[PDB]
Amino acid sequence: SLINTKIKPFKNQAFKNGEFIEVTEKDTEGRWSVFFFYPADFTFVCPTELGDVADHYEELQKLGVDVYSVSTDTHFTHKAWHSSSETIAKIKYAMIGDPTGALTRNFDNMREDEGLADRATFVVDPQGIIQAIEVTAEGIGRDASDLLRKIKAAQYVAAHPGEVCPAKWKEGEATLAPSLDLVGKI
Amino acid sequence: SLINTKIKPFKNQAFKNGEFIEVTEKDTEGRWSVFFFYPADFTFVCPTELGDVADHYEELQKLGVDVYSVSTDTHFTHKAWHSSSETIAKIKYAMIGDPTGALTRNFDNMREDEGLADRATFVVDPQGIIQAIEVTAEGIGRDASDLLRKIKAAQYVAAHPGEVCPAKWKEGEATLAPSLDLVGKI
Amino acid sequence: SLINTKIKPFKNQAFKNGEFIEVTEKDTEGRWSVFFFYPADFTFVCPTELGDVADHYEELQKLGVDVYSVSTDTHFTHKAWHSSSETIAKIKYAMIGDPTGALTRNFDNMREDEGLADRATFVVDPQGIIQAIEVTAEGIGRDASDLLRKIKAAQYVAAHPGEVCPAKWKEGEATLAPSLDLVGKI
Amino acid sequence: SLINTKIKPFKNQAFKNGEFIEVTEKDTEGRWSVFFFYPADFTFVCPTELGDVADHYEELQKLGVDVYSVSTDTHFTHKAWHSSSETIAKIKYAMIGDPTGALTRNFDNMREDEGLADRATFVVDPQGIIQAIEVTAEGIGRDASDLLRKIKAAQYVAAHPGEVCPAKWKEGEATLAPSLDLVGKI
Amino acid sequence: SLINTKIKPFKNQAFKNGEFIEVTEKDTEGRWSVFFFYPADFTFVCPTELGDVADHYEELQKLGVDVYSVSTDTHFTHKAWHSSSETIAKIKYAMIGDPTGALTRNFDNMREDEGLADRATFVVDPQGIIQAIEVTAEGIGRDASDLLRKIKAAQYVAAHPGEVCPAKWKEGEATLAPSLDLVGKI
Amino acid sequence: SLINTKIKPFKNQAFKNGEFIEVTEKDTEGRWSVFFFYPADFTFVCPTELGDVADHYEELQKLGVDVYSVSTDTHFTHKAWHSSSETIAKIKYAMIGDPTGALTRNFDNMREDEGLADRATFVVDPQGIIQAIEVTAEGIGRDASDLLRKIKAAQYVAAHPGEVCPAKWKEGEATLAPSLDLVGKI
Amino acid sequence: SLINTKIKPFKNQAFKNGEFIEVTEKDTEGRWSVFFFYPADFTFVCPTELGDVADHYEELQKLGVDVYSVSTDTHFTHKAWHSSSETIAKIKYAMIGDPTGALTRNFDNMREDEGLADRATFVVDPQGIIQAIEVTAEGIGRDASDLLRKIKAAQYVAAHPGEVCPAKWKEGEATLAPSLDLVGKI
Amino acid sequence: SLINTKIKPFKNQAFKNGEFIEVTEKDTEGRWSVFFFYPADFTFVCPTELGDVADHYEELQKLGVDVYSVSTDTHFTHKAWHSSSETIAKIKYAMIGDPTGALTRNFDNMREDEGLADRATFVVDPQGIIQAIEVTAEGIGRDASDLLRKIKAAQYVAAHPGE
Amino acid sequence: SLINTKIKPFKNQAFKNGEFIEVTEKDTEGRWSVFFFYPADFTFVCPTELGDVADHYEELQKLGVDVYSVSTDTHFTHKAWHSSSETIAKIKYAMIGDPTGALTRNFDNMREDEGLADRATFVVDPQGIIQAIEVTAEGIGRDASDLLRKIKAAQYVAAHPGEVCPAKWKEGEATLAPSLDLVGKI
Amino acid sequence: SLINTKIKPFKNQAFKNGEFIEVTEKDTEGRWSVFFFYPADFTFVCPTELGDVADHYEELQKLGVDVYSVSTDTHFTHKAWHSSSETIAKIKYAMIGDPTGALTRNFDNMREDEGLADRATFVVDPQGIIQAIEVTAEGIGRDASDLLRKIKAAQYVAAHPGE
Ligand SMILES: [Cl-]
Ligand SMILES: [Cl-]
Ligand SMILES: [Cl-]
Ligand SMILES: [Cl-]
Ligand SMILES: [Cl-]
Ligand SMILES: [Cl-]
Ligand SMILES: [Cl-]
Ligand SMILES: [Cl-]
Ligand SMILES: [Cl-]
Ligand SMILES: [Cl-]
Ligand SMILES: [K+]
Ligand SMILES: [K+]
Ligand SMILES: [K+]
Ligand SMILES: [K+]
Ligand SMILES: [K+]
């Protein structure tokens, strides 16, 4: 996988809160970023996942986390979808259009026989390093609550070097501090 | 990612419930499989994740799912770890040794500069197709309850071809049926 | 240019009169076809051109000519645009979705830096041979009265071998008979 | 197609109003140009098309548009054809000779098995960018009224940036202003 | 040079005595053939040479010799030239058109920067073997009388194996009969 | 052919009027040169052609023309031939030896399966440009009176850049002046 | 073999006397070193060979010899092995972990189908040159007292250039002085 | 290293007990073999090492073990050395000549800048598998008692796998 | 050198006792042959070496040895040389002409910068194997009596396998019998 | 062949008059040299040929000519052969050892399937140019009187070019 690799440069048009904007890797530098890939606008599993991310967007913003949804549809289609669907209408984050497929291919996430992105989510730190990846099949929906758990653990580990978050770790729980002494004890 | 691709052939030695055995791709044919990769035996986050999977192993076996944990350590080391850790001692699934790194590379999961596998989990169906992938960075532990939810959704979609599981789908909740009429109405 | 070349095989999904269908080269065998490329759904020049073709569609169906509009948007987007716009709602011909860009690339008509097709029209005969090409710039709209004239002249030449349509040919006007005696006489 | 590409440099001899001249890309800098390709001197469809362009030549010179007809015959042959035919004797524009096929190949317009150019027309702006393309089959003649309409729309779009000519645009008719508010409103 | 090599296959259109015909290498098999290349129709040195060949054509035919003049002009241009020039009007041999340049390139005789053939003449025997080559610069005219001398010597040598025609040989003169005895005597 | 190409550098030993000398391309700079190739010393057609050239050598020297006869034999063999043949004894021009075949290959005149040069003659001007080429088969002797006519025409055209020598042109006869008016009037 | 070659650079982690350290080729500069390779930790066989080197380690350190045992297991596994086994607990020299196989491949000692090192011992001098090598199959014991003898002989020849140690040489025994008069004398 | 690999085919001339013989890999089949490489005849460490192996040859032959000494010199040179040196005169095993260096290179044991073999000993089982390898520097002689101990260990593990 | 290699196939013309013949490797089968190379005919030096082989030619033929002298000159030149020189006139063996250099290159005996063979002699046995070679610079005479001695020794060893001819061996002298007991005895 | 080419640089050990020396191409500069190749020490044609060159060495040294015998054996082997054979004991010129075959291959004179040099003699002038080459089959001995005659001829043409 692309775990522990730096994101590549990109330049794309996006729809964000009634305006068209340009997004590049420079917008991600010094921020926490979620790249939320999905196959197509005006489809079925796709809106439900985007709406669930929209429900956590206020908290994600409080934690310094930007969200970028991405599909191979244009930014024009994203606006039409935002205006016609009550689930998409609640999106306040940038909806990137990747019709060249370049951003999708930067993340090795193209379904090359369909020209659509796979259901992949990537957590990117302020240095551009990918810290968490989740990929699901066409029919399996992703859950924003587990993404939030992971973002919080990735933020804790960044702030507490020398510590690690064990399995099932949540805010305000015991962390392991790797040492020679701890080797073979757990 | 390797999403919706077929697993590659392999032949590895494993430690399983007090004995050494060979595991190959033919042992996965006709069953649901979890390939759970981790970097090293006798470390820190690794046992909490493996123990957490062992706590759900009776439910996974009730669902027809086999677990294979994998690291680049040998099956001898897995056995020793199983005898010295209270957490590893509760594993009743196969602990695969991948000292050549071939199983890890099949899954494109090697840290080549370390000779250790990344913290990657793959859900593979009875036809050898990868249906869900999760990868986390060195200090971020995985959560088996999310793994189980994804296996159940993967089992549902395989059992109901014309249906899809939306975001946050749990057993019994409202599914979606992709069609011309559902386009843009969610 | 691709003039007097055979169309390449293709398999694409499309929206046509409230139903999703599959279109291939096999569906064009034995018929006259108009492949009407345009850059993107939900834009400005594209619907006016698509409406202009729709206006001349009864006349085209009487002449045995099938219309296939094409863009790199999906068929789901075409269905949504059909429901959203009164101009597009009057289209009774097949709206092909080409998210892979393959059908666009068969006609060497991709804007490779944009992932959008250019404004190009191809007249294709019952034997798969391109008999007329028209490409205009992003801001210049095409005119169906030109397309129909060229279509009728294409139909005359095929139904009358040994004759050729001179400049400004309309039904009932004089035609040339290529021969040795006529060389340099016009 | 070559739409929205820059013309390549060239150096060809030509016949123009009783004199032989050299034409290069430098002669088209700062002017609007029509490259009118045709297969061969002393044929049948070619003079009728060339005569039709000659008829609209005063109107083209008023709009700052230069005409350059092209074939793989030499300039000596164009001079002889000018003297031989009453249709060709009325041509006041430059008749380029392209025996090397280089100018034809710059426009990807060679019939490689015949050594003759196809019936293609290119509208080129003062900056060397192709704004309109028309290719017809050996027996189908082109119509200059179409060329002039496309030329006028090309001139409008360049002289009015931020506007676009919709389908069937004539001088005095309404134009669209691409914006976010207009996305999916037409 | 191409001396003593077999001619290559070719297929070209030609003007011959008021008709258009196809010429291939099969027309040359079992005959003596002269391939008379020249740069362009409607030029200056070119007609004078072709007319001088036309003056010897009756005798050439009496000797079983066919003539094929060749330029990169079309067979249509050859007809126009035949009708408009009193020198070309006297040509009774085939005037081949080589607009693809293929026949010219078979004989390594293209001026690649001009797309015109050089002033080259080739004498080909009934087995397709090139027995005499003459090439001159753009401004130097060829003389049919020396070509006739050469054809007659090539025919004599073919009929009298074991003999050779020395320098300046003409019909009814002494020939050398190569032998060991003759070595060093002349 | 090598018509209108520049001669390549060479360095060869020669026999000339009782002495051995080196001849290079620098010895041709500023003069008219005849490279007269033949297959072998002590043979049959070769001496008649060489003797015939020697009979015109005073006129050629009066015209500023140097003669170089060439074969793949050595300069030693040329000297011996010159001492034993009454015909070769009258040669006062350089007899070049080309045992390596390099001078012959420069002129693309080697029979590779024999190690002998073909019966080829090249006329080279003071700038090293080949202006006339003649090649004949093994048994067909060349005629020096035709060679002289071609040198004179080559000298005239070099001395009168805007003029050309038509077919059968001799010193003093009517020349042609290429222009727009002369096109198709001969 | 690698006899008389220089060791290659390396950088590995190790377990040494209760602490984790980094070892590189720079730690070997100016010292005598022993690289002691073995297939795997935690196997069922008693590690007598490693224990036997530990029994001789005080004497080796008196002779300025550093010991590095190497396997493809991690330094975490070595520490666990050291805590679990009485034989391994005697080890006071560095236990290098080589999970990438890179130190093992530098000594051309990898079993590529297993991902384990062979049972090879290399004696390295202060300039990095390999002076002795021993490789045995499983069950063929490597004797540490034969290793000490070899090291002592290597140290003797380094301190007495011009002398060589014959078969069975030990401190106090006679050496040979390579000379011309000694040729064929033993 | 070449540990646990099968020896490669070879064909060489040798001197043995006053006669010249040909030795190939077919002569090693079903026998335990010692390929004992050394750099050059008429030198110094080489005879002491070869003499030490000759002192243990009777014992090695009691263990079913054949010995082949190998250098890049010819079998002609080995015969001369056997007649002129008292140490070499004790050798009753085959002295293989390897002037092409082919046998030396099969064992990857050539000092390519000298055209001489390195001081390497290979223990080879009845199936052609290399079970023990020892290589020492130019100045360090090998010990035949250590070679015998390893050979006895190799035979024990062959007879009793897993103990 | 080419010692103990087999001769390669060849096909050359030759001068032999007033007639021209063809020589191939098949003419050498079953015979002893001498290939006697030399740079050139007709040079100023007296050809003593060829004359000396001619003085010994009756004896060589009695010994079943055929002689072929070879130079890169033609067989025509050899015949002329044979008529002009008293030394060469004594030659009754075949004088091979090698103008392609192919027989000379088979014996790796070409001076590539000269196109002449070196002064090399090769003795070839009835199976085509080269048994003796002698190469000298100019002025270092090749002695035919040393050539006879060498041939006699080669014939002796062919007829007495198991015997070798020592230094200075001649018919009647003692030979050596390669054996173990003879090792170090001479 | 290598006729009229310059000899290539080399560095080899040799036995000469009871001592071991190093010979390189720098030792041949400004001297006439004979490189005399033979297949193997302790054999048959080789000593008769080497002994015949030894019989003419005093004369060759009077002509300013140095002799270097070369085989793929070591300089150690040449010393042993010089002590054990009465024929070799007469040699006062350098016996070069060529175990890497590098000097043999510079003269393109290796029997690659034997690792032995062919019976080739090269006459080399003071500028390093090869002026005469002679090669004979395994069973045919060379004649030193013919080598001397050619050397005298080479010296005459060097001193008097064009006669
Ligand atoms: Cl990934
Ligand atoms: Cl993946
Ligand atoms: Cl096109
Ligand atoms: Cl185009
Ligand atoms: Cl040619
Ligand atoms: Cl040519
Ligand atoms: Cl090694
Ligand atoms: Cl090894
Ligand atoms: Cl040779
Ligand atoms: Cl040679
Ligand atoms: K490992
Ligand atoms: K798209
Ligand atoms: K043309
Ligand atoms: K020659
Ligand atoms: K050797």
Contact G182 H44 (CB under 8 A): yes
**Topology adopted by domain E1-186:** Glutaredoxin (3.40.30)
Distances, alpha carbon C52 to alpha carbons C37, C61, C142, C178, in Å:
14, 15, 9, 35
Closest Cα in chain E, distance from residue D76 (Å): 6
Main-chain dihedrals φ then ψ at residue J92, nearest 5 degrees: -115, 0
Q: Which residues pair with D127 in a beta bridge?
A: none
Top residue of C100, C104, C105, C138 to mutate, by most chain A CBs within 10 Å, is: C100
Angstrom distance (rounded) from CA J32 to CA B113: 62
**Do the beta carbons of residue H9 and residue H102 sit within 8 Å?**
no
Any chains having at least 3 CB pairs less than 8 A from chain G are A, B, H, J
Cα four-point dihedral sign I95, I101, I106, I107: positive
Any chains having at least 3 CB pairs less than 8 A from chain D are A, C, E, F
Closest Cα in chain J, distance from residue G8 (Å): 27
Is residue J145 within a helix (H) or strand (E), and if so which, with residue range? helix J144-159
Strands annotated E in chain F:
11-16, 19-24, 32-37, 65-71, 94-97, 110-111, 116-117, 119-124, 130-136
Distances, alpha carbon A68 to alpha carbons A16, A78, A122, B167, H54, in Å:
10, 12, 10, 17, 81
Angstrom distance (rounded) from CA C9 to CA E32: 50
Q: Which residues of I131-149 are buried (b: 16+ CB within 10 A; e: fewer)?
A: bbbbbbbebbbbbbebbbb
From A3, A4, A88, select the one nearest A47 (Cα to Cα): A88
The neighbour count for residue F7, using CB atoms within 10 Å, is 21
Long-range residue pairs from C136-139, CB within 8 A, at least 24 positions apart, any chain: C136/D3, C136/D131, C136/D132, C136/D133, C136/D150, C137/D3, C137/D4, C137/D131, C137/D132, C137/D154, C137/D157, C138/C39, C138/C45, C138/D4, C138/D164, C139/C45, C139/D153, C139/D157, C139/D163, C139/D164, C139/D165
**Do the beta carbons of residue C54 and residue D169 sit within 8 Å?**
no
From A63, A20, A181, select the one nearest G80 (Cα to Cα): A181
Tokens for H38, please give them: 């050394």
Distances, alpha carbon E3 to alpha carbons A126, E176, H90, in Å:
76, 22, 80
**Do the beta carbons of residue E15 and residue F129 sit within 8 Å?**
no
Report H helices in I25-112. Answer: 48-55, 57-62, 75-84, 86-89, 102-106
Please, is A22 exposed, middle or buried when counting C-beta atoms within 10 Å of its C-beta (0-12, 13-18, 19+)?
Answer: exposed
Residue D50 is classified by DSSP as H
Task: Count each helix (H run) and each strand (E run) in chain J, helices first.
Answer: 5, 9
The neighbour count for residue D76, using CB atoms within 10 Å, is 28
Angstrom distance (rounded) from CA A50 to CA A36: 8
Tokens for F88, please give them: 């070769």
Task: Return the active site residues of B.
Answer: 46
Task: Tell how far the Cα of A100 is from the centroid of ligand 1, in angstroms.
Answer: 19
Task: Return the active site residues of C.
Answer: 46
Question: Is chain I touching chain J, with at least 3 CB–CB pairs below 8 Å?
Answer: yes
Closest Cα in chain A, distance from residue D178 (Å): 11
From A5, A38, A11, select the one nearest A103 (Cα to Cα): A11
For residue F112, give the chain I residue with the closest CA. I100
Report H helices in chain C. Answer: 45-55, 57-62, 75-84, 102-106, 144-159
Question: CA J82, J87, J89: angle at the middle one, nearest 5?
Answer: 35
Tokens for D162, please give them: 């931020």
- Residues whose CB is less than 8 angstroms from the CB of residue I40 and which lie 6 or more positions away in sequence, other chains included: F74, F76, F77, F99, I71, I72, I73, I116
Main-chain dihedrals φ then ψ at residue H88, nearest 5 degrees: -65, -35
Angstrom distance (rounded) from CA B184 to CA B176: 13
* Dihedral angle over CA of B155, B156, B159, B164, nearest 10: -120
Looking up tokens 């070509």 gives: E147
Name the residue type at position C172.
G
Any chains having at least 3 CB pairs less than 8 A from chain F are D, E, I
Proximal ligand: closest to the CA of A4: 1
Closest Cα in chain C, distance from residue B1 (Å): 18
Contact I120 J81 (CB under 8 A): no
Task: Tell how far the Cα of J6 is from the centroid of ligand 10, in angstroms.
Answer: 12
The resolution in angstroms reads 1.8
Tokens for D90, please give them: 């009325």
Q: Which residues pair with G130 in a beta bridge?
A: G124
Which among G3, G45, G46, G63 is annotated as catalytic?
G46
Task: Count each helix (H run) and each strand (E run) in chain C, helices first.
Answer: 5, 9
Residue G3 is classified by DSSP as T
**Do the beta carbons of residue D43 and residue C180 sit within 8 Å?**
no
- Residues whose CB is less than 8 angstroms from the CB of residue E179 and which lie 6 or more positions away in sequence, other chains included: none
Report H helices in chain D. Answer: 45-55, 57-62, 75-84, 102-106, 144-159
Q: How big is chain B by its Cα radius of gyration, in Å?
A: 17
Three-state DSSP state, I69: strand
Report H helices in chain G. Answer: 48-55, 57-62, 75-84, 86-89, 102-106, 144-159
| Chain F residues with a Cβ under 8 Å from any Cβ in chain I | 40-43, 72-74, 76-77, 79-81, 84, 98-101, 112-116
| Chain J residues with a Cβ under 8 Å from any Cβ in chain G | 18-20, 76, 79-80, 83
The neighbour count for residue G113, using CB atoms within 10 Å, is 8
Q: Which residues of F130-141 are buried (b: 16+ CB within 10 A; e: fewer)?
A: bbbbbbbbbbbb
Top residue of J13, J79, J84, J95 to mutate, by most chain G CBs within 10 Å, is: J79
Task: Tell how far the Cα of A110 is from the centroid of ligand 3, in angstroms.
Answer: 28
For residue A108, give the chain B residue with the closest CA. B1
Angstrom distance (rounded) from CA D25 to CA J136: 75
* Dihedral angle over CA of E147, E151, E156, E161, nearest 10: 110
Proximal ligand: closest to the CA of H108: 8
CATH architecture designation of domain H1-163: 3-Layer(aba) Sandwich (3.40)
Taking contacts as CB-CB distances below 8 angstroms, the residues of chain I near F100 are 112-115
Tokens for I168, please give them: 């200075």
Task: Count each helix (H run) and each strand (E run) in chain H, helices first.
Answer: 5, 9
Distances, alpha carbon F161 to alpha carbons C180, E139, E141, F176, in Å:
39, 9, 15, 11
Task: Tell how far the Cα of A122 is from the centroid of ligand 12, in angstroms.
Answer: 21
Nearest to F99 among I79, I80, I115 (CB): I115
DSSP characters for H94-153?
A: EEEE-TT-HHHHHTT-EETTTTEE-EEEEEE-TTSBEEEEEEE-TTB---HHHHHHHHHH
Taking contacts as CB-CB distances below 8 angstroms, the residues of chain D near F181 are none
Proximal ligand: closest to the CA of H130: 8
Main-chain dihedrals φ then ψ at residue A32, nearest 5 degrees: -95, 135
DSSP characters for I113-145?
A: TTTEE-SEEEEE-TTSBEEEEEEE-TTSPPPHH
Tokens for A75, please give them: 């930014």
**Do the beta carbons of residue C137 and residue D112 sit within 8 Å?**
no
Three-state DSSP state, I26: helix
Taking contacts as CB-CB distances below 8 angstroms, the residues of chain A near D180 are 18-20, 79
Taking contacts as CB-CB distances below 8 angstroms, the residues of chain C near D144 are 167-168
**Do the beta carbons of residue I130 and residue J14 sit within 8 Å?**
no
Angstrom distance (rounded) from CA G29 to CA G167: 29
Angstrom distance (rounded) from CA J1 to CA J18: 35
Task: Count each helix (H run) and each strand (E run) in chain B, helices first.
Answer: 5, 9
Question: CA F106, F111, F112: angle at the middle one, nearest 5?
Answer: 85
DSSP characters for B27-70?
A: GTTTSEEEEEE-S-TTSSHHHHHHHHHHHTHHHHHHTTEEEEEE
- Residues whose CB is less than 8 angstroms from the CB of residue F138 and which lie 6 or more positions away in sequence, other chains included: E4, E164, F39, F45, F119
Which among E46, E60, E96, E103 is annotated as catalytic?
E46
Q: Chains C and E: how many Cβ contacts under 8 Å? A: 11
Q: Which region, left, alpha or beta, applies to residue E27 given φ > 0 means left and ψ of -120 to 50 means alpha?
A: alpha
Domain range list for chain G: 1-186
Tokens for D53, please give them: 């362009």
